[PDB]
Design an enzyme around this catalytic site. Structure first.
Site, PDB file in Angstrom:
ATOM      1  N   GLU A   6       5.389   4.800  11.625  1.00 15.61           N
ATOM      2  CA  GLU A   6       3.943   4.701  11.768  1.00 15.61           C
ATOM      3  C   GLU A   6       3.620   3.693  12.866  1.00 15.61           C
ATOM      4  OE1 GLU A   6       2.681   3.665   7.832  1.00 15.61           O
ATOM      5  OE2 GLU A   6       2.430   5.758   7.210  1.00 15.61           O
ATOM      6  N   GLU A  59       0.847  -1.187   0.000  1.00  8.04           N
ATOM      7  CA  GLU A  59       0.000   0.000   0.000  1.00  8.04           C
ATOM      8  C   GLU A  59       0.884   1.239   0.000  1.00  8.04           C
ATOM      9  OE1 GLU A  59      -3.031   0.504   3.201  1.00  8.04           O
ATOM     10  OE2 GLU A  59      -2.610   2.645   2.966  1.00  8.04           O
ATOM     11  N   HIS A  60       2.021   1.144   0.684  1.00  7.15           N
ATOM     12  CA  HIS A  60       2.966   2.254   0.777  1.00  7.15           C
ATOM     13  C   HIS A  60       3.681   2.518  -0.535  1.00  7.15           C
ATOM     14  CE1 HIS A  60       3.451   3.663   5.040  1.00  7.15           C
ATOM     15  NE2 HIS A  60       2.607   2.659   5.204  1.00  7.15           N
TER      16      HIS A  60
END
Ligand SMILES: CCCCCCO[C@@H]1O[C@H](CO)[C@@H](O)[C@H](O)[C@H]1O
Ligand SMILES: CCCCCCO[C@@H]1O[C@H](CO)[C@@H](O)[C@H](O)[C@H]1O
Lengths: 441, 423, 99, 61, 43, 49
Positions: free
Chosen positions: A136, A59-60
């Site tokens: 994160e 996703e990154h």
């Protein structure tokens, strides 16, 4: 027009399918904007201990450049047309979607196709995201709510893929290689596992056309020995308590095993959860709120907030509640919450069930407000139910729920059942598991 | 499948000045809002915070419905009642299934035209001002934006959306009554509806909102002053905003500023993207490697504020702010390409259309136009007004910012945060 | 004249001899306590002093000079509007609890 | 296709509080009779011919 | 209604550009209060 | 990271019928509870006698 006529006037969701298996679904409106995206049956439930976090890592990288549009070229293109590109990953689904002007639908579909099939995954970019992800993880550690929910899954589904967090353990983040990711991608990102959904000012025929043009190359085979299927995930009545007296408020999440997406019982369960409801210190209703738990909590200042939930997965789920309170209020909060589950199992009244039904009706409709919420409903529904359930059907399902149905369904999932409990913070007062278990009957 | 319519927005202005506007979308649920010119700008030095308490008092007893009935009655039909405020308007909105609009409307009307502000209920509600404010102020942006307005204006728009601490526990029933009576008047109200028929909404307004009060008590015009408020709190990150007086909403110059905002960068478009087409972001990035920056644009009825907002590590505050400022100076010097302006216009146009996509955005848009211009400008026209903005207008807006007297607000460990005169 | 017996009963009752008003003698149940809590400052403080003065007289087995006795004609209910509303609110909650 | 032994008693007689108590009740009566008779039988067997009830016939109405 | 706010408030994070992106304010603020939903503050 | 937190293996304590992580434990829940309540019922009758 009555509310009944309103449900019958909603445009039906058109569904088509390409040769490679890709499903294409859309709901047409006259909005000059739209949302189009790709929903995928991929998530951490499909990951093993060794590649847990792979999906999140991808996703990154998804928007960091493609073979055709290297680096920030994809970015510049999305921005210059005033579109928005977003994504999200959960334990079972992953989505990539774009909000754009209806007239830009062709470029929107091309970009999604490009993203989903030609992601660069440049080694240097992979090293950069590695650090972003680690940071994160640190930030998420400061979110007590996210921590407690990850803990609930860790204990309720211990020993199964559902126990895993979406982000994965930090050591996996430090070691995942381009190989691991490309591997993850080839196995899961197949046409039969994807749904191209769109809602807004566009026609199904145009979307289908664009899908045939940009997604046909997507594999629809895989083979036979590489078709990621899901095994049932055992649920375990258990408890995980992370005591940290340094934190100002305690977070507690408790749940019994839910039925899973496809089950009809989810409607009655949603009605029951609507009766108990949600609450937080900023609510204007206070002592007059209809939910006994909400008014007791408000008048006696028992918590900062609480929320019931019904988290669904293929064949199982988490049905329960989460609350945030002062270290001296945990036992009282648990007492009142469990008492409310028992009252519903044995004595739900027709009037409170009607309120619950009305709350659910309002939530269902107010949720499908805008092209993005609608597009998401289409994508997820096709993956979970294999079809878009129309509002008229939802109404029929809600309509058949009455006090008798609520007592029976609640008794089935809550009564004398073993819950999974997760606590975090100054939890010296969190009740012993035996006491919590006895509270279930 | 082909959609139902799409019908048009119906508009009706009553003799007393009240505007009613509705759109039947044939949806299963309805959304109705009563917009009023009663935002915080209308409070004066002697009754600050009165509108904040008013915002929190929507479920207090009214002549036609007890506090208990309002809560239980709305919840019985799974309805919703909320109050939203800006520095200029207050909007009371109700949501419910379309067959229950009669019920929600009765409560809405009681709350806005017949509140009792009983002495004991008003006293009991005061503590909520403290809780509500503490929650909002957990957001540094709230601290900075409130201080920014206080620094920029001598009055009116200078007022905070939140009650001053010294006033908590001091807002009286008489001040609440006074406030409602001076501002909840026919010529300052607009009843907007979505998912309801215009005739019913019209008959409701005619029979129950046939109040008077005319234009009510307008406030003094906002007087821009300029200044700076620095809030030292030692946070690892410094939040800061630098603005200059721009233009009142409704003017052509306001459009130039909206386009300038999108040239500079007005928010992310890609999840975790590098904001490649954001002028301010790329300028800071060149001279700095953890921060965030964004053009800031606030347009009001008689004034406006324009500039940028920055978030950075405390030691890099000066570098980020100066880099951002210098980038705006280059635009003011004419260094602006046509492709940049077109992209900005695209973002702005797509942005506007996306904001009226949901019932909430739609209602807020119609309700605001109804109170600001007492007329309706359709999307088609708005987009044209956007296309009409010239590159030179954008450059001129930038020049107005650069040479204009500045207002600044900052919070965090300010050891390296510069003062206006150091920019 | 029912009114005749009334003034006669008022004096026979005798709370007026302690300088009390009729509402000062009401038996406090939960409705009454809430009503008293809603009294404006002046009525609350006046009530407190009349009661304190009466309890003091009672302790001394004394009564006020006749000219200071509360007068039948001047005794008005300061509590009624507040108590009536408190009871009305409760009855409303009870009807909703019945549904 | 069906439950087991304990799974039947649970759903049937233990899941409820009203029926679970009734099971204990009626179960008590039947338990009492059988328990008492069986225990008396064992006692009398261990002491065969020694108790009054065993030699009573030689003297008895 | 029964749609809880996106973020529930409690009373008595960021460590990277990515998570900081979007936090800078861009418009005037709005304050909302509800009967059934958590309060909110925009921009 | 809190995500580095994994519930330890309890296989040495689990009842045989809930040892398979790929199988739902709801099929044996009735039997497992039925036994305990039988025990509880028999104890109650014993004490009552
Ligand atoms: C029997 C005790 C239940 C709680 C009593 C509160 O009762 C409530 O008090 C409010 C004022 O604070 C009124 O506005 C409301 O109508 C009333 O129902
Ligand atoms: C408790 C016994 C009740 C008898 C009724 C009293 O009646 C009262 O008697 C007084 C003395 O003569 C009169 O002055 C007065 O006018 C009369 O109403």
């Amino acid at each position: 027009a009555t509310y009944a006529q309103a449900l019958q006037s909603v445009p039906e969701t058109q569904v088509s399918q390409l040769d490679n298996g890709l499903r294409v679904a859309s709901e047409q409106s006259s909005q000059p904007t739209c949302t189009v995206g790709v929903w995928i049956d991929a998530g951490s439930r499909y990951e093993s201990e060794k590649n847990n976090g792979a999906g999140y890592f991808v996703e990154h990288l998804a928007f960091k450049g493609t073979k055709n549009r290297p680096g920030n070229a994809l970015e510049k293109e999305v921005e210059s047309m005033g579109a928005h590109l977003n994504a999200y990953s959960t334990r079972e689904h992953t989505a990539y979607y774009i909000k754009a002007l209806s007239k830009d639908l062709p470029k929107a579909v091309e970009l999604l196709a490009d993203i989903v099939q030609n992601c660069s995954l440049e080694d240097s970019q992979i090293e950069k995201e590695r650090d972003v992800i680690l940071q994160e993880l640190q930030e998420n550690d400061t979110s007590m709510r996210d921590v407690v929910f990850n803990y609930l899954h860790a204990t309720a589904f211990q020993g199964t893929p559902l126990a895993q967090s979406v982000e994965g353990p930090s050591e996996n983040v430090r070691k995942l290689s381009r190989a691991d990711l490309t591997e993850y991608l080839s196995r899961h990102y197949k046409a039969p596992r994807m749904v191209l959904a769109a809602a807004g000012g566009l026609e199904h025929r145009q979307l289908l056309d664009l899908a045939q043009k940009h997604f046909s190359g997507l594999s629809g085979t895989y083979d036979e020995d590489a078709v990621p299927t899901l095994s049932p995930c055992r649920f375990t009545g258990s408890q995980i308590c992370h005591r940290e007296d340094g934190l100002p408020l305690a977070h507690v999440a408790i749940a019994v095993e839910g039925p899973g997406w496809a089950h009809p019982d989810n409607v009655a369960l949603q009605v029951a959860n609507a009766i108990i409801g949600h609450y937080d210190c900023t609510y204007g209703g206070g002592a007059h709120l209809s939910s006994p738990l909400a008014s007791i909590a408000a008048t006696n200042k028992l918590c900062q907030s609480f929320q019931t939930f019904n988290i669904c997965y293929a064949d199982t789920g988490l049905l329960g509640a989460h609350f945030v309170c002062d270290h001296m209020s945990i036992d009282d909060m648990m007492f009142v919450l469990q008492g409310q589950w028992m009252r519903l199992c044995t004595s739900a009244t027709e009037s409170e069930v009607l309120r619950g039904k009305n709350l659910l009706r309002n939530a269902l409709v107010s949720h499908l407000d805008g092209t993005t919420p609608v597009c998401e409903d289409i994508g997820r529904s096709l993956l979970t139910y294999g079809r878009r359930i129309p509002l008229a059907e939802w109404e029929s399902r809600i309509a058949e729920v009455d006090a008798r149905v609520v007592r029976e369904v609640c008794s089935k999932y809550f009564y004398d059942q073993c819950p999974a409990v997760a606590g975090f913070g100054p939890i010296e007062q969190l009740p012993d598991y035996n006491r919590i278990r006895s509270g279930m009957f | 499948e082909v959609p139902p319519h799409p019908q048009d927005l119906e508009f009706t202005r009553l003799p007393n000045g009240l505007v009613i506007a509705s759109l039947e979308n044939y949806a299963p649920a309805s959304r109705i809002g009563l917009f009023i010119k009663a935002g915080s700008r209308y409070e004066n030095s002697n009754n600050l915070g009165t509108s904040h308490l008013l915002r929190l008092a929507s479920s207090l007893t009214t002549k036609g419905a007890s506090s208990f009935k309002i809560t239980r009655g709305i919840e019985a039909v799974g309805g919703k009642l909320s109050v939203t405020s800006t520095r200029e308007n207050m909007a009371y909105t109700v949501e419910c299934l379309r067959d229950d609009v009669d019920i929600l409307m009765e409560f809405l009307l009681n709350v806005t035209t017949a509140p009792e502000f009983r002495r004991w209920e008003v006293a009991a509600l005061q503590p909520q001002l403290r809780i509500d404010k503490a929650v909002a102020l957990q957001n540094p942006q709230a601290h900075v934006i409130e201080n920014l307005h206080a620094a920029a204006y001598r009055n009116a728009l200078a007022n905070s959306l939140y009650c001053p601490d010294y006033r908590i526990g001091k807002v009286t029933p008489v001040e609440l009554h006074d406030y409602v009576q001076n501002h909840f008047t026919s010529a300052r109200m607009a009843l907007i509806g979505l998912g309801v028929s215009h005739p019913v909404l019209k008959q409701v307004a005619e029979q129950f909102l046939n109040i008077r009060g005319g234009l009510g008590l307008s406030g003094a015009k906002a007087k821009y002053h300029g200044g700076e408020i620095r809030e030292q709190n030692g946070d690892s990150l410094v939040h800061a905003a630098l603005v200059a007086e721009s233009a009142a909403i409704g003017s052509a110059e306001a459009n130039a500023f909206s386009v300038l905002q999108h040239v500079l960068g007005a928010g992310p478009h890609v999840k975790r993207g590098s904001n490649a087409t954001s002028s301010l972001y790329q300028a800071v990035a060149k001279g700095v490697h953890p921060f965030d920056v964004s053009a800031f644009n606030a347009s009001y009825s008689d004034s406006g504020l324009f500039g940028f907002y920055t978030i950075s590590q405390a030691a890099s505050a000066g570098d980020v702010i100066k880099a951002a400022y210098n980038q705006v100076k280059t635009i003011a010097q004419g260094n602006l390409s046509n492709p940049d302006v077109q992209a900005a216009k695209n973002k702005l146009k797509a942005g506007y259309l996306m904001s009226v996509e949901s019932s909430e955005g739609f209602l807020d848009e119609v309700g605001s136009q109804a109170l600001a211009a007492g007329s309706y400008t359709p999307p088609s026209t708005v987009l044209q007004q956007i296309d009409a903005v010239a590159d030179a207008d954008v450059i001129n807006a930038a020049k107005k910012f650069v040479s204009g007297r500045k207002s600044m607000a900052a919070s965090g460990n300010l050891g390296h945060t510069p003062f206006i005169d150091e920019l | 004249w029912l009114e005749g017996i009334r003034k006669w009963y008022y004096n026979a009752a005798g709370f007026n001899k302690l300088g009390l008003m009729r509402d000062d003698t009401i038996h406090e149940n939960d409705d009454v306590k809430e009503a008293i809590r809603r009294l404006p400052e002046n009525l609350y403080d006046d009530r407190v002093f009349r009661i304190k003065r009466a309890l003091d007289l009672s302790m001394r087995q004394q009564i006020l000079p006749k000219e200071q006795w509360t007068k039948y004609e001047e005794d008005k209910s300061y509590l009624e509007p507040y108590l009536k509303e408190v009871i009305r609110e409760r009855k409303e909650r009870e009807e909703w609890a019945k549904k | 296709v069906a439950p087991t032994l304990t799974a039947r008693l649970y759903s049937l007689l233990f899941r409820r509080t009203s029926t679970f108590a009734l099971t204990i009740v009626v179960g008590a009566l039947f338990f009492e009779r059988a328990f008492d008779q069986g225990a008396d039988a064992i006692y009398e067997h261990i002491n065969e011919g020694k108790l009054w009830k065993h030699i009573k016939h030689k003297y008895e109405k | 209604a029964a749609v809880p706010a996106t973020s529930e408030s409690p009373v008595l994070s960021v460590l990277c550009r990515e998570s900081l992106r979007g936090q800078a304010a861009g418009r005037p603020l709005v304050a909302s209060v509800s009967l059934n939903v958590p309060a909110s503050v925009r921009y | 990271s809190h995500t580095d937190i994994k519930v330890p293996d309890f296989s040495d304590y689990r009842r045989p019928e809930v040892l398979d992580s790929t199988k739902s434990s709801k099929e044996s829940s009735e039997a497992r509870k039925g036994f305990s309540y039988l025990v509880t019922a028999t104890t109650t009758v014993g004490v009552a006698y």
